[PDB]
């Protein structure tokens, strides 16, 4: 019997800063125990200062991104070159996904950018369109490996202030882009060690008011 779905592995990671956002993802593409590509871009600049990644079944992911990029193009045509806000993009993507509620795009999607007040924004989706704005989100194969680390190191969960002994929490001080990129690189290095579908390369897309910037880092190829 024909199986229309597949699993191309990979892992993605979005973190929202005070006035910036990052969306990262490994560049490895796989089927079963084989490597298709060591460098196959997975995170895309979709225009209007928005970055997007649909991780899981690559065919469905590429189709979704292609369709959303197309939605942005037609938004400009239909609404006098108005900029598509990150909240408006998120709602648009919900409808793209739920339109195939009974034959789902088999992907976990994440977009990142800046809200209309200039603050960093990440939005996270499920395969059938349910979404919400979040501060931190890892998606894909090693999502369960990475998310707890981020609960601990980004939102300071289970961390208290010494001497008080569990009475006073660690205060939620904001993170700089340099600090976030460290947590991203350590997150992927750790995921690469313990997950066979993660490796080869890491590509990070950083979003600020100045635009979209890219950073690439090597990962273990085993």
């Amino acid at each position: 019997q024909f199986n229309p779905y597949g699993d191309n592995g990979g892992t993605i990671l979005g973190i929202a800063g005070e006035d910036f956002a990052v969306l990262a993802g490994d560049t490895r593409n796989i089927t079963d125990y084989s490597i298709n590509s060591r460098y196959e871009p997975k995170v895309f600049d979709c225009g209007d200062n928005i970055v997007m990644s649909a991780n899981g079944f690559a065919a469905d992911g590429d189709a979704l991104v292609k369709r959303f990029k197309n939605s942005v193009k037609w938004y400009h045509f239909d609404h006098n070159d108005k900029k598509l806000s990150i909240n408006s993009a998120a709602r648009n993507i919900q409808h793209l996904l739920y339109g195939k509620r009974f034959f789902p795009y088999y992907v976990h999607t994440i977009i990142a950018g800046l809200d209309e007040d200039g603050k960093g924004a990440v939005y996270s989706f499920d395969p059938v369109g349910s979404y919400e704005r979040e501060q931190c989100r890892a998606g894909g194969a090693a999502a369960s490996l990475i998310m707890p680390f981020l609960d601990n190191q980004v939102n300071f969960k289970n961390q208290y202030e010494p001497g008080t002994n569990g009475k006073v929490k660690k205060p939620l001080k904001y993170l700089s882009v340099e600090e976030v990129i460290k947590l991203v690189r350590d997150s992927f290095t750790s995921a690469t060690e313990r997950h066979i579908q993660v490796g080869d390369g890491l590509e990070i897309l950083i979003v600020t008011k100045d635009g979209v910037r890219k950073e690439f880092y090597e990962l273990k190829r085993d």
Partner: protein, 231 residues
């Protein structure tokens, strides 16, 4: 006379009067000029207002990053035809990862307009279009008529009093074709061309509309204080 009731009827001399009447709507429309060099292509359009309280009707429409047009006649028909071009330019990109050739865009418009001239019930399009674009064979300018006839040109003009601008371009042919790597000078030649079609009124800041596309220049429209430089 007896043979102008619908588009499905030839006259005794082999004329299609409904198509000719649709052609008449273009002559009533405001003037628009098109011209190109080897590097860039430029549209210049005289916008028309209803009165002093009203805005100036937009004339230029973007179809893709590398293609767009200016209109003269029934504006809603231009919206339909430009929407069709947007879809066709987009079908070429999504399916073939290919920017639609300006010549092929003209062929598609011709064939769309033609179907309306041979069938009962419908009507011809009541608008003329000047399509500019930059593709793999350089800069291009097309003139569309709702009879179906599409023509590739160095320069042209359509609308009321368009003959004056068309004569100017016919003289200036050898000069403006050579304006390579100089967008501002090519626009100047277009603004000077459209000026030959003006009477009583002159080019003001909210009157003039300009668009350009080229080698390293996406299709962009200039309105308002952005065209004060060229007045």
């Amino acid at each position: 006379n007896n043979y102008d009731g619908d588009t499905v009827t030839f006259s005794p001399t082999g004329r299609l009067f409904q198509v000719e009447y649709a052609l008449e709507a273009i002559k009533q429309g405001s003037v628009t000029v098109g011209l190109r060099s080897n590097t860039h292509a430029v549209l210049v359009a005289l916008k028309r207002n209803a009165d002093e309280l009203s805005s100036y009707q937009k004339k230029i429409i973007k179809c893709d990053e590398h293609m767009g047009l200016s209109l003269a006649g029934l504006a809603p028909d231009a919206r339909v035809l430009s929407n069709y071009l947007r879809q066709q330019c987009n079908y070429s990109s999504l399916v073939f990862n290919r920017k639609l050739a300006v010549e092929r865009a003209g062929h598609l418009l011709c064939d769309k307009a033609q179907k309306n001239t041979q069938s009962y019930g419908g009507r011809p399009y009541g608008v003329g279009l000047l399509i500019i674009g930059y593709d793999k064979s350089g800069a291009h300018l097309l003139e569309f008529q709702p009879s179906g006839n599409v023509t590739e040109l160095y320069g042209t003009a359509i609308g009321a009093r368009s003959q004056g601008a068309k004569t100017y371009l016919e003289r200036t042919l050898d000069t403006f074709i050579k304006i390579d790597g100089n967008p501002d000078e090519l626009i100047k030649a277009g603004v000077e061309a459209i000026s030959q079609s003006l009477r009583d009124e002159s080019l003001t800041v909210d009157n003039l509309s300009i668009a350009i596309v080229g080698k390293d220049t996406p299709f962009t429209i200039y309105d308002g204080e952005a065209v004060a430089k060229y007045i």
